[PDB]
Structure formats: C-alpha cells, structure tokens
C-alpha cells in the first residue's frame, strides 16, 4: 500500500528515492537508561532524528508525544484499536 | 421494566414519559449542583409534585 502511494506521490514532485528497512524492527518510544535522564529515542523515529533518514512512510500513530519533536502531515486513513480472540 | 440513569429517554426527555420528584427536597439540591446533569433540572423544575406520599 504505502509504496504504491509513494510511487503515485513521486510521479508528481520530481523525486528520486532510496528505500531501506529499519535496523531492529521496533516502532519507537522514548527510552532513558540509568545515568542518562533524557529519554533518548530508539527505533525508526530515532533513526530519522539521527540523520540517516529523510522521511518515514509507514502506518505510524499520531500520539501527542511524537508531534512534540516531528511535524506530521494530514492523515490519510482514520482508524482505531481492537481485540483479536480465536473464534 | 426500566433502567438506571442511562437511557436516552432521560438524557433527552420525551413527551410520553414524565420524570418527577418531590419538590423542596435534598434531591433538588443534588440535581441543582451537577454541571452536566443541569438540563434534567430544567425538566424537573417544569413539573414536580410539591407534595408527599399523596404524589
């Protein structure tokens, strides 16, 4: 889905793209280890903040904490959360 | 037959069902000091038997 959307987007703004997967597979939250009170970022959000990335294209969430440091765009699909049980 | 204070018939008063209490009671103050429930007082103040077991 997202890569097809990326193709349709790049066909309009003179783009050249290099796509590469995340390092560890974790989505990303603030993380603070002892002797370091600042909750340093880890995940693809931390990779983007580091400088290796230029844009993230994945089904990311728009929770309050993420918007503090990174400017988002208008959402393209609203949804919620649900529970899965065997039946 | 009926339910607690959750039904839309009480959230939105209906012309068929009538909700009334005893006037000049502690319940009057209780419904006169709730922010969200204020509108029910609007119904309750409209018609409530200023009465007793007669009601």
């Amino acid at each position: 889905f997202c890569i097809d959307l990326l193709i349709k987007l790049a066909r309009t703004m003179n783009f050249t793209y290099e796509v590469h997967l995340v390092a560890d597979g974790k989505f990303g939250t603030q993380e603070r280890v002892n002797n370091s009170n600042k909750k340093e970022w880890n995940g693809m959000m931390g990779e983007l903040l580091s400088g290796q990335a230029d844009m993230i294209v994945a089904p990311l969430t728009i929770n309050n904490e993420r918007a503090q440091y990174i400017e988002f765009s208008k959402p393209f699909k609203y949804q919620g959360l649900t529970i899965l049980v065997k039946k | 037959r009926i339910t607690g204070i959750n039904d839309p018939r009480l959230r939105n008063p209906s012309d068929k069902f009538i909700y009334a209490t005893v006037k000049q009671s502690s319940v009057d103050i209780y419904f006169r000091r709730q922010v969200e429930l204020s509108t029910m007082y609007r119904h309750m103040e409209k018609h409530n038997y200023e009465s007793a077991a007669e009601a």
């Binding site: 988002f72 208008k74 959360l81 | -």
Partner: protein
C-alpha cells in the same frame, strides 16, 4: 499473530486496520467490539522542510479524486472469502 493463533496467548490488542484485514485474510479469526481510541496514519519528517507542506496538500488532492479509496478497495476488496 502466530503465537495467539497457536493458542499460546488468548487475545491480541492491535490497530483496527491490520487485524481487520488479517482476520478476513487468513481464517477463522474475528474481532469483537469497536474502537476505544481513534486516530490515523500520516507522513513524518524533520521540522521546517517544504516537502512536508507540499505532500500534505497532495494527500488531500489524492483523497478528493478517490485515488486512495480506489487503491484501498483494490487491495482489501479481494478478501472475506
């Protein structure tokens, strides 16, 4: 998904779209209830870069003409077998 399907766990708490497609996709699994939180996906980049504004306009541009809806229908409609 594999663990809870193998009855190692009982229920999985996850986003509505992923499970809503996968339940109709694999077999025998259905979700119960509805959302208790509501939000959507989006694109994210570093602060103050014009790509952000331009793609934000382009996303609504695509939404107006049904391109996103058509793509979603194409990629989720062949399910619920």
């Amino acid at each position: 998904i594999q663990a809870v399907r193998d009855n190692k766990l009982h229920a999985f708490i996850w986003d509505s779209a992923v499970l809503e497609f996968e339940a109709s996709q694999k077999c025998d699994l259905v979700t119960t209830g509805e959302l208790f939180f509501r939000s959507g996906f989006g694109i994210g980049m570093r602060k103050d870069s014009p790509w952000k504004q331009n793609v934000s306009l382009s996303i609504l541009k695509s939404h107006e003409n049904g391109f996103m809806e058509d793509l979603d229908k194409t990629w989720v409609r062949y399910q619920e077998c």
